[PDB]
Curated annotation (Swiss-Prot):
Protein name: 4'-phospho-dehydrooxetanocin synthase
Keyword Isomerase: yes
Species, as recorded: Priestia megaterium
Entry cofactors: [4Fe-4S] cluster; cob(II)alamin
UniProt entry keywords in alphabetical sequence: 4Fe-4S, Cobalamin, Cobalt, Iron, Iron-sulfur, Isomerase, Metal-binding, Plasmid, S-adenosyl-L-methionine
Length: 731
């Protein structure tokens, strides 16, 4: 007894409707499939299985082991990877595409349908700066396994607030064959607590699961885990092939020492490292699973997508890295647009406004024949053809905008590429300037110059892109104050940030040449604001992590100079992987420590101002924002004032004099003394300018111009700040 063609096409049409709701969890899809075949009661069946994802989602209706219906409304069944592994020539020489097939007396296929179970736990918080973003990276591991139909995958993501006890209860209830922990930056201690509970339930006989832990940032050593969890498997950030091979091992198709990308302890007590084949991201990794959207439906912010994996770690010496090189692998233009449309359509279902965060380590990249810019342009043209416009954020190196070592034609094509990004909705973009000193840029490995950074900021800002930069002022290997003075001059330049320029009448080559060579064009379109206005974190000091070339450079300086820089005997932070490192230059270490105390001394008041700013009405919003602008301004020239007291020069005297006159503080302790005692005296002097600002804040709060919280937080923190002037006895 066969199904009629009408019943097949009816089932295919309804399943295509059910499968279109890609925000539904697999169990919710299965329930809607059960309702479909029950409401039209044609045949009795024993089991239902849904696998695949988006455009290859597949339903298996198991009447019996000897009669299995397979529905694939979105893709040719001949491409089904599960059937291919069972019997790769089941379709013989059929030349037409197959969307329904009933397998009769195929007892081995029934065994293939008893898929293993994987539970992925994402230890990840929602990043809030500059805007909230929901990380979807762990969903690619699930979507790979679903697309390959290798396992039933459950996602537990702590971004929605799932507690530790809830995670444990979920694991014990689901009893998965494999548990995968994704450890994001700063969640290593949380992973240790969760692994403690998991292994207690394993020793207690409540749970038997293979456990893998993947660290997003390799600022760790595997021995930190093996010491406490000797049976744990440590895998790569890209765990697709690792989970594939572990599922093969469960089906007794592979031995443990054949599993891709795992590091483990064998029976001899030694650490074994298995080979790690590079994941074919472009061809095998589909749209990230969107199970998380239903768990947090009122999220407002950006949704993350990785349009490529890999990067060039040789351009960042403070970025941790593995011993294995990770090549840059982009999605095709068409597949990038497909995944974007999937995420945008799913976000629209939950009233999430179209805002994508490109989580790529290297978004623009580099291809043969310089076609990487054409990929970005083609993706932008795809976005321009949609009905609803989007915002999208991403990060980029300064030499991805402007590179004097390349031809002028190459740079003009890059300017065109960035323009298409602006047209397609590029919103907040992060440029990794990191320094304005050519020496410090080399220690950072950026391969870039100070002037090149200025021009890169000039080109991007002129296109209307909201810009912010990272900037690491102090680093431990710096000797002398020359690099600090170069950074201050860089950060004070007002010929970098351009207003959004109307370029409808120009060519890209005209705009390029005018922005680089026409001083009159540059003066006309500048915003007048200095570079430091777009620095993410002011007065930042280098934090050295494990497995970074900068840490190696530091260790080598300890050797060839016979000095101790890395403290705590070399033991780094167990949660973060950060070394406690002293500055090789004592004066620079005192300045860095002085700036950290400055931040700590102002944190109470300025954090209250910022939190009030988020909720104030438009008029108070503008007043509270001027407070923050002045605070950043005062914080910048604090370091210039410190450096000036340690090494005066003619120009820094004129600049500080103009600044002091602007604030009616022309007045305002030894000269050249870089001791902790003198630096504090210079800072306590400059703290008087900060007092003038907070007197305006105090006056506006008493006039009622600014509204305080219910608990009078601004009033208390102001009163405490005024009492604690000087008094740096809080370190």
């Amino acid at each position: 007894t066969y199904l009629s063609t009408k019943s097949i096409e009816y089932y295919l049409k309804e399943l295509k409707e059910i499968f279109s709701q890609i925000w539904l969890k697999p169990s919710e899809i299965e329930k809607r499939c059960e309702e479909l075949f029950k409401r039209s009661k044609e045949f009795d069946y024993k089991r239902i299985l849904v696998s695949g994802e988006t455009d290859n989602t597949t339903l298996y209706v198991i009447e019996d082991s000897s009669k299995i219906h397979v529905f694939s409304p979105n893709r040719d069944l001949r491409e089904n990877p599960l059937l291919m592994r069972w019997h790769p020539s089941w379709y013989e020489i059929e030349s037409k595409e197959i969307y329904y097939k009933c397998f009769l007396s195929c007892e081995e296929l029934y065994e293939h349908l008893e898929l293993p179970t994987v539970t992925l736990v994402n230890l990840c918080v929602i990043e809030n700066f500059p805007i909230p973003r929901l990380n979807l990276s762990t969903g690619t591991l699930s979507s790979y396994l679903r697309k390959e139909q290798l396992a039933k995958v459950e996602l537990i993501d702590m971004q929605v607030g799932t507690t530790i006890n809830q995670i444990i209860k979920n694991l014990l209830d689901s009893q998965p064959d494999i548990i995968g922990l994704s450890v994001n930056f700063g969640q290593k201690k949380l992973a240790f607590e969760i692994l403690d509970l998991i292994y207690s339930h394993i020793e207690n006989g409540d749970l038997s699961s293979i456990i893998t832990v993947g660290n997003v940032i390799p600022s760790f050593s595997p021995e930190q885990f093996f010491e406490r969890y000797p049976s744990l498997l440590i895998c790569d950030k890209e765990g697709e092939y690792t989970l594939r091979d572990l599922i093969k091992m469960l089906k007794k198709e592979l031995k443990l020492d054949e599993v891709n990308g795992i590091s483990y302890v064998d029976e001899s007590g030694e650490v074994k490292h298995n080979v790690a084949e590079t994941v074919n991201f472009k061809e095998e990794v589909p749209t990230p699973s969107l199970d998380i959207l239903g768990e947090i439906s009122k999220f407002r912010g950006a949704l993350t997508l990785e349009t490529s994996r890999g990067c060039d770690y040789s351009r960042c010496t403070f970025c941790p890295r593995d011993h294995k090189l990770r090549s840059w692998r982009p999605l095709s233009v068409e597949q990038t647009l497909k995944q974007l449309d999937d995420i945008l359509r799913a976000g629209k279902h939950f009233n999430i406004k179209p805002h994508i965060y490109m989580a790529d380590e290297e978004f623009i990249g580099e291809l043969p024949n310089g076609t990487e810019a054409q990929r970005i342009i083609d993706i932008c043209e795809g976005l321009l053809k949609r009905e609803e416009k989007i915002k999208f954020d991403f990060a980029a190196r300064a030499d991805s905008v402007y590179e004097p070592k390349r031809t002028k034609e190459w740079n003009v094509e890059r300017l065109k590429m960035w323009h298409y990004c602006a047209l397609a909705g590029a919103d907040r973009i992060f440029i990794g300037v990191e320094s304005g000193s050519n020496q410090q840029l080399k220690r950072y490995g950026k391969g870039t110059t100070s002037e090149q950074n200025i021009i890169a900021l000039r080109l991007v800002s002129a296109l209307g892109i909201n810009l912010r930069i990272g900037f690491i002022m102090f680093d431990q290997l710096m000797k002398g104050l020359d690099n600090l003075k170069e950074n201050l001059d860089f950060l004070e330049r007002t010929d970098a940030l351009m207003k959004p320029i109307d370029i409808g009448d120009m060519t890209y080559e005209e705009l390029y040449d005018k922005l680089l060579n026409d001083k009159e064009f540059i003066e006309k379109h500048k915003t007048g604001k200095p570079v430091y206005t777009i620095v993410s974190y002011m007065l930042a000091s280098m934090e050295i992590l494990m497995n970074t070339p900068y840490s190696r450079m530091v260790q080598l300086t300890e050797r060839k100079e016979e000095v101790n820089l890395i403290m705590n005997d070399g033991k780094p932070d167990m949660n973060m992987g950060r070394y406690a490192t002293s500055f090789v230059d004592k004066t620079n270490g005192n300045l860095s420590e002085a700036c950290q105390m400055w931040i700590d001394s102002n944190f109470g008041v300025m954090y209250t101002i910022k939190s009030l700013h988020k909720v104030a009405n438009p008029r108070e919003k503008k007043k509270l924002y001027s407070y923050m602008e002045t605070h950043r301004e005062i914080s910048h020239f604090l370091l210039k004032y410190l450096v000036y007291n340690l090494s005066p020069d003619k120009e820094s005297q004129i600049i500080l004099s103009d600044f002091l006159r602007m604030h009616s503080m022309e007045h305002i302790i030894n000269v050249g003394d870089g001791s902790k005692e003198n630096i504090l005296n210079v800072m306590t002097n400059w703290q008087l300018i900060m007092e003038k600002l907070l007197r305006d804040v105090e006056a506006d709060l008493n006039k009622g111009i600014i509204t305080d919280s219910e608990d009078h937080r601004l009033h208390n923190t102001l009163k405490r700040w005024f009492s604690d002037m000087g008094n740096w006895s809080l370190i």
